Amino acid sequence: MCLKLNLLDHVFANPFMNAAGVLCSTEEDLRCMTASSSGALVSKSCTSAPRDGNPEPRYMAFPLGSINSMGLPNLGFDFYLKYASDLHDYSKKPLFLSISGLSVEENVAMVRRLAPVAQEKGVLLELNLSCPNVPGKPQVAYDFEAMRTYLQQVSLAYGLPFGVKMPPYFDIAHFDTAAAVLNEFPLVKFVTCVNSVGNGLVIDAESESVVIKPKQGFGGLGGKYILPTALANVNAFYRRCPDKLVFGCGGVYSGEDAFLHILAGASMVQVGTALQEEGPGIFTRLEDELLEIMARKGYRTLEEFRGRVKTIE
Amino acid sequence: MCLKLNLLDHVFANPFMNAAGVLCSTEEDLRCMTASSSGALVSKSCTSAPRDGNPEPRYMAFPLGSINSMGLPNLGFDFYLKYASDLHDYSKKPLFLSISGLSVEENVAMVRRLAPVAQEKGVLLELNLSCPNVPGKPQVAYDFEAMRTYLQQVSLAYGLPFGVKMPPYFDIAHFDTAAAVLNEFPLVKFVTCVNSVGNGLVIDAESESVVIKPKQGFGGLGGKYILPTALANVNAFYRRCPDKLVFGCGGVYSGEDAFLHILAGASMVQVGTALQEEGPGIFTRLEDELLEIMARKGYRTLEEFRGRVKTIE
Ligand SMILES: Cc1cc2nc3c(=O)[nH]c(=O)nc-3n(C[C@H](O)[C@H](O)[C@H](O)COP(=O)(O)O)c2cc1C
Ligand SMILES: Cc1cc2nc3c(=O)[nH]c(=O)nc-3n(C[C@H](O)[C@H](O)[C@H](O)COP(=O)(O)O)c2cc1C
Ligand SMILES: C=Cc1c(C(=O)O)[nH]c(=O)[nH]c1=O
Numbered sequence: 338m339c340l341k342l343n344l345l346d347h348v349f350a351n352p353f354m355n356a357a358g359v360l361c362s363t364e365e366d367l368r369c370m371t372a373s374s375s376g377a378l379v380s381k382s383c384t385s386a387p388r389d390g391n392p393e394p395r396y397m398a399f400p401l402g403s404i405n406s407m408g409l410p411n412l413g414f415d416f417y418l419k420y421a422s423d424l425h426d427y428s429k430k431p432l433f434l435s436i437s438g439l440s441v442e443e444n445v446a447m448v449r450r451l452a453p454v455a456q457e458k459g460v461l462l463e464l465n466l467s468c469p470n471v472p473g474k475p476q477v478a479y480d481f482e483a484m485r486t487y488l489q490q491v492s493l494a495y496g497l498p499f500g501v502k503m504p505p506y507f508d509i510a511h512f513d514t515a516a517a518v519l520n521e522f523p524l525v526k527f528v529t530c531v532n533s534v535g536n537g538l539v540i541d542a543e544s545e546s547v548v549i550k551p552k553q554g555f556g557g558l559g560g561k562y563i564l565p566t567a568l569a570n571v572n573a574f575y576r577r578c579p580d581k582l583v584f585g586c587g588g589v590y591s592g593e594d595a596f597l598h599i600l601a602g603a604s605m606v607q608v609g610t611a612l613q614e615e616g617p618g619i620f621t622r623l624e625d626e627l628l629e630i631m632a633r634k635g636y637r638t639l640e641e642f643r644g645r646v647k648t649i650e
Numbered sequence: 651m652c653l654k655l656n657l658l659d660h661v662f663a664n665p666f667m668n669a670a671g672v673l674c675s676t677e678e679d680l681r682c683m684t685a686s687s688s689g690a691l692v693s694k695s696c697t698s699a700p701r702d703g704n705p706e707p708r709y710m711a712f713p714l715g716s717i718n719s720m721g722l723p724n725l726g727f728d729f730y731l732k733y734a735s736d737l738h739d740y741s742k743k744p745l746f747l748s749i750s751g752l753s754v755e756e757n758v759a760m761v762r763r764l765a766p767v768a769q770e771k772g773v774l775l776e777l778n779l780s781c782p783n784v785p786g787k788p789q790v791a792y793d794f795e796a797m798r799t800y801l802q803q804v805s806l807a808y809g810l811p812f813g814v815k816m817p818p819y820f821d822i823a824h825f826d827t828a829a830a831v832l833n834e835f836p837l838v839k840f841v842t843c844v845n846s847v848g849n850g851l852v853i854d855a856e857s858e859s860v861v862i863k864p865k866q867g868f869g870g871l872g873g874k875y876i877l878p879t880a881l882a883n884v885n886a887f888y889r890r891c892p893d894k895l896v897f898g899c900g901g902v903y904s905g906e907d908a909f910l911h912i913l914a915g916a917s918m919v920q921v922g923t924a925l926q927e928e929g930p931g932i933f934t935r936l937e938d939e940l941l942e943i944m945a946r947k948g949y950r951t952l953e954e955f956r957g958r959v960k961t962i963e
């Protein structure tokens with residue numbers, strides 16, 4: 338029985354990886370993700386310049402999930418590029434690099450420099466169009482004209498296969514329009530669904546207080562709260578983008594959650610909140626639990642059930 | 651100690667009511683909600699003509715909440731109007747009537763006939779802008795030009811105070827624009843936040859199947875999944891609509907959950923999924939639990955903590 342996958346011209350031991358932003362900021366974090374049993378890893382979304390991000394507390398977790406308004410802390414593009422160029426051991430696993438510049442121009446500037454490294458090393462770009470936690474910068478992918486602009490400019494400037502990190506949508510018309518935009522861009526080879534469910538508000542009853550400091554306590558939700566949202570967006574894009582790959586992200590704590598993602602159409606499966614709370618040992622557990630489910634059902638490979646969710650009637 | 655409010659020229663014994671669509675479809679249901687210890691009730695959202703709604707199964711519940719694509723089954727506006735005009739005992743509690751026509755013209759036709767019964771009996775209109783389960787009819791309040799048209803035409807035709815049931819938003823810019831649209835209308839006196847989180851997907855791992863039949867298994871999420879999203883929206887609108895009331899709905903299962911809604915800004919607190927699962931006895935428990943949290947903290951009135959959620963720094 339077999340968790341292996343071969344996509345985007347890379348071989349993966351298994352479909353699991355961190356979600357961008359979790360355990361991927363520093364050289365130490367990246368070496369740790371590389372030493373884990375994950376199939377791949379993705380670096381922290383980066384900006385051209387280093388950023389401290391928001392004041393603390395800016396992340397909090399609870400039994401049903403997490404809220405964050407990190408504010409895009411990162412070591413800067415120069416660092417992640419060097420990591421991809423000189424530091425990462427590609428014989429261990431493939432590496433994705435996530436970028437999230439605050440304007441199209443900043444993105445374009447980064448991808449121009451990433452291109453020769455991607456050509457030479459095989460690093461894969463994840464372009465983040467869904468940051469919900471910068472004030473005055475609502476999610477780019479909630480504005481379909483802006484989204485089209487960003488993807489035009491990045492396709493032109495980069496000219497290699499890349500993927501995009503999408504926010505969650507909640508409306509059939511938005512699924513239809515968003516997939517249609519993405520389908521205009523043949524270099525977009527994968528779509529990662531989803532980023533956090535934006536601008537939730539956790540309130541502590543005892544202290545009568547919000548639990549994160551930035552934005553008056555408003556922040557992106559992950560974890561158990563979001564699984565069915567995440568599964569909907571995976572399947573919605575899987576059905577709407579038949580020539581692209583869909584990576585799942587949201588609500589994965591178990592092999593069973595990963596199984597559902599895969600049924601829904603996911604190729605890679607990313608782990609955020611649960612990985613933040615449990616640490617990189619989660620990857621061996623998720624592998625075992627997914628293999629147990631497959632063995633019980635008679636599935637010998639991932640592609641035997643990927644996208645095979647049944648509807649009624 | 652007793653939980654009294656005077657909102658919208660009506661008196662209420664406590665801030666609890668059903669969420670529209672739960673336990674409010676038939677005469678029996680409404681008599682049941684009237685006989686409960688709820689502070690008020692709201693009728694099932696109605697259309698001009700009766701509707702059978704979508705094929706079954708169309709609702710399912712789970713430890714973390716519910717998914718539904720009911721398809722707006724209802725007995726038709728003539729029935730709900732007649733319930734309001736002739737059958738409801740206003741001496742027991744106030745009644746809200748929810749309308750959800752599939753076009754601006756259908757809503758205008760209904761409110762013209764509701765107006766005389768609102769004038770005679772005091773029934774309160776809740777105009778639903780947020781139904782996520784009719785195929786080819788995406789949520790009206792996710793299109794701000796359509797939302798404006800609906801509130802202009804209803805305000806003109808109805809000419810009396812009313813409220814609106816809103817879908818959840820997830821983006822600060824959308825909160826800003828949605829609240830500004832609402833603020834253009836002085837007859838909109840209350841804003842109910844929120845309707846179900848639209849188009850989630852629940853998948854059963856054993857059967858590999860979606861669990862509802864309509865829309866390929868896609869439906870609105872309610873229950874524990876949505877509490878932080880609901881809090882966010884109640885607070886967002888409470889902050890941006892200082893001259894309107896905010897009614898909270900989403901994820902209420904306990905007195906503590908209602909305490910958080912009120913802290914975030916809620917005047918009335920609506921109970922959907924939990925009421926569907928537990929039944930109308932929930933209302934005595936919610937009251938008892940809310941009173942007990944108030945006593946332990948020394949609050950004697952709701953007014954003392956409504957909207958008083960603390961931020962950090
Ligand atoms: C602390 C934190 C940092 C994150 N940073 C990023 C990021 O830099 N870029 C990004 O695309 N998403 C980021 N995310 C979102 C995750 O990648 C993921 O989309 C979201 O957490 C949902 O997955 P989960 O339910 O497993 O948490 C972050 C999430 C958390 C909790
Ligand atoms: C079976 C079912 C039917 C519903 N019908 C309606 C409706 O007719 N009108 C409406 O405005 N909301 C309707 N809703 C949404 C609820 O009013 C409520 O906004 C949502 O369930 C979130 O609250 P909860 O977390 O307490 O369930 C319905 C919800 C359920 C589960
Ligand atoms: C890149 C910023 C993001 C962040 C962040 O650094 O604030 N948090 C998220 O949940 N998603 C993001 O996309």
Ligand SMILES: C=Cc1c(C(=O)O)[nH]c(=O)[nH]c1=O
Binds near residue numbers: 718720721
């Ligand atoms: C009015 C129809 C609605 C329904 C429904 O009848 O399908 N379900 C919801 O969750 N929200 C609604 O607004």
